[PDB]
Amino acid sequence: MQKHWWHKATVYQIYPKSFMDTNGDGIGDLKGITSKLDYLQKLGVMAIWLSPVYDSPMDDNGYDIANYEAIADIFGNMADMDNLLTQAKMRGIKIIMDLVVNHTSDEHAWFIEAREHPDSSERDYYIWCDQPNDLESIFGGSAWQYDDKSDQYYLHFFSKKQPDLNWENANLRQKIYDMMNFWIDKGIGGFRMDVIDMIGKIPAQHIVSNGPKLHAYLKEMNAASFGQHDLLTVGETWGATPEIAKQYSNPVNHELSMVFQFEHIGLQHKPEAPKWDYVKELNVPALKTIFNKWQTELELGQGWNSLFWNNHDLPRVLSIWGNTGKYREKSAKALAILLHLMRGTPYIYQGEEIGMTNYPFKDLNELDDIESLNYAKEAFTNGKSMETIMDSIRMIGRDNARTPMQWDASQNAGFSTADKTWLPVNPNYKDINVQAALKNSNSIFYTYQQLIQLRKENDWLVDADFELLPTADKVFAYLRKVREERYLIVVNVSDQEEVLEIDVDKQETLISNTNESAALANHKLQPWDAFCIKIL
Ligand SMILES: [Ca+2]
Ligand SMILES: [Ca+2]
Ligand SMILES: [Ca+2]
């Protein structure tokens, strides 16, 4: 197991439009991010996964790129970007850019030429057809959009303004590599690869993710760009299984460092049902099976896990799986303890470290996300009341993760000085904000800070194995072992008292949000009790 700088790293995901606004337009920008690097350094993260800040029409808020080498005017300019890289590096922080190459904006120059001149080479940069099959767009409707100018349908698994790139075109792939090397030379620390498991798509055969040439393309990409460097590459792979992740992350395959797997996220909705048909409560026994599987199947040297609870497309963890009332702070720490002490690279989504929650959206106008808006329009004429629709969106809507970062108790939680913010600031900012989190020595922030420091200083977080222990349904306990070291992690993922039928010899407490001694002696766990102790 060759160790790289990122094996001890914790990554922080920033959603640019909602992090920090510095010019009063109600939207976050690059200078905003740069001004908060001391805060992130204090937190201890070693890298930032920066969501798209490239030139874009914003149909999918940055994931529909019109120019891979230009900063969207709304975030600032290339000078601001360069300074961010510089200032971040000065503080031990690397920047991981969001690589979105499965598709581009329909306003990208390649597509404009493809449509304007169907004989051009860029025409083959996309996927066209005369007779469309029944493939569907992930944002609703057909994945094929009819273009009346050229008289053919172009593929788009996402919005109509996000035409898919043709990865069978070796020349297109090379263009992508040239663009990737453009960013590599600027000093980035890696790439977060957007739906990367779709580049092996074969539309005509209804093959989307995990296509036959997927890994060959990744090997080619690696060899043509990031491979020669020591960067962190993580792919967003919704169709990833432990076996597939081994192929992606085992160093011997020369592909990626790790990938985001969404099997645990699948528990947020009924099996074989739309994400909108959400599950009210976390099936802890189900989560235990999934986490244990990924921990066991990806043994050191054979692969590497990424660890996350939420992102810019998911409900904040406290709202979907934690507690947002009497045990908000405690459940937040519990969930933090539970995830970060497993083997892998953990990712913290902005606001997660202070325990932010979903937002109580009142109506559709207040929303912004095309996915939710498309869902609402369809659902309303298919048996769903507006109230039922708004209820699903308040729980699952991607906009819940996109409300402004809550810095303090001043106007707009200190996010901006503008009359209004692009997305509304959650009123709970009066109680939930960075300033208040930093002031309280035992706040959620310090739990994450401590977890981050434990990983940077102790090899066992990486070297130790993982063993799930038999416990009550809602109790998530496991031990990490290596050499003469044995670590016991116990987390009561429950709003109520649970049993703990174990006997151990505690020799050291690494971290705890409660009186771990009392729990061990009384053989019972208080709601959301969580701790890691070194045992004999
Ligand atoms: Ca701004
Ligand atoms: Ca026509
Ligand atoms: Ca003002």
TrEMBL record:
Which parts of the sequence belong to the Glycosyl hydrolase family 13 catalytic domain?
13-402
Q: What does this protein do?
A: The physiological substrates may be short isomaltosaccharides.
* Keyword Iron appears in the UniProt entry: no
Q: What is the name of the protein in this document?
A: Glucan 1,6-alpha-glucosidase
Alphabetical UniProt keywords: Glycosidase, Hydrolase
Catalytic activity, as annotated: Hydrolysis of (1->6)-alpha-D-glucosidic linkages in (1->6)-alpha-D-glucans and derived oligosaccharides
SMART domains in UniProt:
Aamy (SM00642)
- Which gene holds the coding sequence for this protein? dexB
Which InterPro entries does the entry mention? Answer: GH, GH13_cat_dom, Glyco_hydro_b, O16G_dom_2
